[PDB]
Amino acid sequence: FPATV
Amino acid sequence: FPATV
Amino acid sequence: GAMGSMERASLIQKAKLAEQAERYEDMAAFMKGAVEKGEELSCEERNLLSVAYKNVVGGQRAAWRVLSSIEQKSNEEGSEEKGPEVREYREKVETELQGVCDTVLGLLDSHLIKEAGDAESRVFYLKMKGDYYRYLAEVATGDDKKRIIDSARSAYQEAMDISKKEMPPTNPIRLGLALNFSVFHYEIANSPEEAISLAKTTFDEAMADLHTLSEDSYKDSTLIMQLLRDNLTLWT
Amino acid sequence: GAMGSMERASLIQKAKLAEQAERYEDMAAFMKGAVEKGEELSCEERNLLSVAYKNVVGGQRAAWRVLSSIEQKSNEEGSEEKGPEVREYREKVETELQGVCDTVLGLLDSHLIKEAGDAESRVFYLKMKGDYYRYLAEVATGDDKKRIIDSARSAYQEAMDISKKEMPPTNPIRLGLALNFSVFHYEIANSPEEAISLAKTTFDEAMADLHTLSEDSYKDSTLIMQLLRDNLTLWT
Ligand SMILES: *CC(=O)Nc1ccc(-c2nc3ccccn3c2Nc2c(C)cccc2C)c(F)c1
Ligand SMILES: *CC(=O)Nc1ccc(-c2nc3ccccn3c2Nc2c(C)cccc2C)c(F)c1
Ligand SMILES: [Ca+2]
Ligand SMILES: [Ca+2]
Ligand SMILES: [Ca+2]
Ligand SMILES: [Ca+2]
Ligand SMILES: [Ca+2]
Ligand SMILES: [Ca+2]
Ligand SMILES: [Ca+2]
Ligand SMILES: [Ca+2]
Ligand SMILES: [Cl-]
Numbered sequence: 001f002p003a004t005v
Numbered sequence: 006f007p008a009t010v
Numbered sequence: 011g012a013m014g015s016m017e018r019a020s021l022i023q024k025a026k027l028a029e030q031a032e033r034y035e036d037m038a039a040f041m042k043g044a045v046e047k048g049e050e051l052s053c054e055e056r057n058l059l060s061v062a063y064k065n066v067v068g069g070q071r072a073a074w075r076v077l078s079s080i081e082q083k084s085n086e087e088g089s090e091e092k093g094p095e096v097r098e099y100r101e102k103v104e105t106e107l108q109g110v111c112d113t114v115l116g117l118l119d120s121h122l123i124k125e126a127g128d129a130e131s132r133v134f135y136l137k138m139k140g141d142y143y144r145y146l147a148e149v150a151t152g153d154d155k156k157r158i159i160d161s162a163r164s165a166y167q168e169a170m171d172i173s174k175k176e177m178p179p180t181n182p183i184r185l186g187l188a189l190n191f192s193v194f195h196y197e198i199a200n201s202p203e204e205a206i207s208l209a210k211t212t213f214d215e216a217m218a219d220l221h222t223l224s225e226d227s228y229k230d231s232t233l234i235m236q237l238l239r240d241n242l243t244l245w246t
Numbered sequence: 247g248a249m250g251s252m253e254r255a256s257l258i259q260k261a262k263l264a265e266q267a268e269r270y271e272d273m274a275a276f277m278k279g280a281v282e283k284g285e286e287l288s289c290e291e292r293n294l295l296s297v298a299y300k301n302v303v304g305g306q307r308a309a310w311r312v313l314s315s316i317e318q319k320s321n322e323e324g325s326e327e328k329g330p331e332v333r334e335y336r337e338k339v340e341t342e343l344q345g346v347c348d349t350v351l352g353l354l355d356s357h358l359i360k361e362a363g364d365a366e367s368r369v370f371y372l373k374m375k376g377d378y379y380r381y382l383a384e385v386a387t388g389d390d391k392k393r394i395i396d397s398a399r400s401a402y403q404e405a406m407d408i409s410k411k412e413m414p415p416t417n418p419i420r421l422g423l424a425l426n427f428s429v430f431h432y433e434i435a436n437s438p439e440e441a442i443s444l445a446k447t448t449f450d451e452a453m454a455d456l457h458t459l460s461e462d463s464y465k466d467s468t469l470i471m472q473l474l475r476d477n478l479t480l481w482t
C-alpha cells in the first residue's frame with residue numbers, strides 16, 4: 001500500500 | 006518482564 | 011454525550027495519557043468529547059484528534075482487507091462452500107468502519123470546518139474530510155459510490171486551492187494533503203497519471219523552497235518529501 | 247447473551263476469522279458465546295478461548311503499567327500537582343481489566359471446570375484460573391489482596407498435582423503451567439527461591455524425557471523449555 005499521513 | 010504462556 | 015460531564019482540559023489531558031498507553035479508542039472518545047464542548051481546537055488539539063481516529067480506522071481498514079481477501083478466495087472456482095459467515099463478519103467490520111468515518115465527518119460538519127478561518131486549520135480539517143470519504147470509498151460497492159468519491163475529491167480540491175494560495179510549498183500540512191490526494195487519484199479515482207504528476211510537482215516545488223527553512227523545519231519538510239518519493243518509486 | 251442467536255459452529259468459525267484479522271475483542275466475544283452454548287470445548291476450541299482473552303487482557307495490562315508508572319512519578323517529591331486525571335484514567339483501565347478477568351473466571355466457574363474430567367482439559371482450565379487471579383493480584387491493593395493471591399495459588403496447585411500424576415514431564419500444558427506458576431512465585435508471592443527451584447526442576451525433568459518424543463513433539467517441548475531457561479537467566 002502507498003504512504004499516507 | 007518474565008515469560009509466560 | 012458520555013463525556014458531557016468532564017472538563018475540556020481533563021479530556022485533553024486524558025487523550026494524551028491514552029496516546030502514551032496506546033489506547034486509541036479511548037483517545038478518540040476523549041477527543042470527540044473535547045470537540046463537542048463547542049470551542050475551536052488548537053494545533054496540538056487538532057493533532058490529537060487526527061492521531062486518535064487515524065489509529066482506530068487504520069486498524070479497522072487492516073482487518074477489513076484481511077476479511078475481504080478471504081471472502082474473494084471463497085468465491086473462486088473449486089472453493090468449497092462454507093456458508094454466510096465470512097460475508098457476515100466482513101460486513102460487521104465494514105459497518106463499524108463506516109460508523110467511525112461517519113462520526114469523524116459529523117464532527118467536521120458540526121461544527122469544526124465552518125468555524126475554521128485560518129488557512130492552517132481549514133486545510134487540516136478539509137484534508138481530514140477528504141481522507142474519511144476516501145476510507146468510505148474503499149469499501150463502497152453500491153449506488154452511492156460515485157457520490158462518495160466525488161465528496162472526497164471536492165474536499166481535497168478545496169483544501170488544495172487554499173493551501174496553494176496561503177501556505178509555502180514546504181508547509182507540512184500542504185505536503186501531507188498533496189501526498190494523500192495523490193493516493194486518492196491512484197487508488198480510488200483510477201487516475202495514476204494525475205497521482206504521479208501531483209506527487210512529482212509537489213516534491214519539486216518543495217525542494218526549491220527548502221533554502222528558506224531552519225534546521226528543524228527542514229527536517230519536518232524533508233521527511234514528508236521522502237514519502238512522496240517513496241510513492242513515486244512504487245508507481246514508476 | 248448477544249451471541250445467543252448464532253450457531254455454535256458459526257461462532258467458532260468467526261473466532262478463527264477474528265484471529266486472522268487480529269480482532270481479539272471480537273474473538274473473545276465469539277468464544278464467550280461458544281462457551282455459553284453449554285457443551286464442552288475441544289482442544290482446538292480451548293486454545294481459541296485462551297488466545298482471545300490472553301490478547302485482550304495483555305493489552306489492558308500493558309496500558310495499566312504505563313499509567314501506573316506515570317501515576318507513581320506524579321507522587322514523587324518536586325512533582326507538580328496535575329489533579330485527579332491520572333488516577334481516574336488508571337482506575338478506568340483497571341476496572342475494565344478486572345471486568346475481563348471476572349468474565350473469564352465466570353466462564354471457568356460456569357461451567358467449564360466442573361465438566362472437565364480428562365487431565366488435559368482440567369489442567370488447561372485450572373491454569374487459566376490461576377492466570378486470571380494472578381492478573382487480578384497484579385492490580386490489587388486493598389483488603390482482599392491476600393485472598394486473591396491465595397485463589398491463584400490454589401488453582402495453580404491443583405493443576406500441578408493433576409499434571410504430575412497424569413501427564414509426562416515434556417507435556418506442553420504441564421510445562422506452560424509450571425512456567426506460569428514459577429512466575430507467580432517470583433512476581434506475586436515474593437518467593438524467588440521457589441520460582442527458581444520450580445523452573446529448574448521442570449526443565450531438568452523435561453530434558454530427561456525428550457528421548458521418548460517424535461521430531462514434532464520435541465520441537466514443541468523444547469520451545470517451552472527455552473522459556474524456562476530464559477526466566478532462569480533473568481533471575482540468576
Ligand atoms: C498544527 C500542525 O501544524 N499540525 C501538524 C500535524 C502533523 C504533522 C506531521 N509531521 C509529520 C512528520 C512525518 C510524518 C508525518 N507527519 C505529520 N502528519 C500530518 C501531516 C504531515 C499533514 C497533515 C496531517 C498530519 C497528521 C505536522 F507537521 C504538523
Ligand atoms: C489442547 C492443547 O494441547 N493445547 C495447547 C495449546 C497451546 C500450546 C502451546 N504451544 C506453544 C509453543 C510455544 C509457546 C507457547 N505455546 C503454547 N501455549 C500454551 C502452553 C504451552 C501451555 C498452556 C496453554 C498455552 C496457551 C500447546 F502446546 C498445546
Ligand atoms: Ca468547563
Ligand atoms: Ca459455515
Ligand atoms: Ca455493507
Ligand atoms: Ca503516461
Ligand atoms: Ca444449534
Ligand atoms: Ca488536571
Ligand atoms: Ca481500583
Ligand atoms: Ca538462595
Ligand atoms: Cl458477525
Ligand SMILES: [Cl-]
Nearest residue numbers: 024334335338
Ligand atoms: Cl477516566
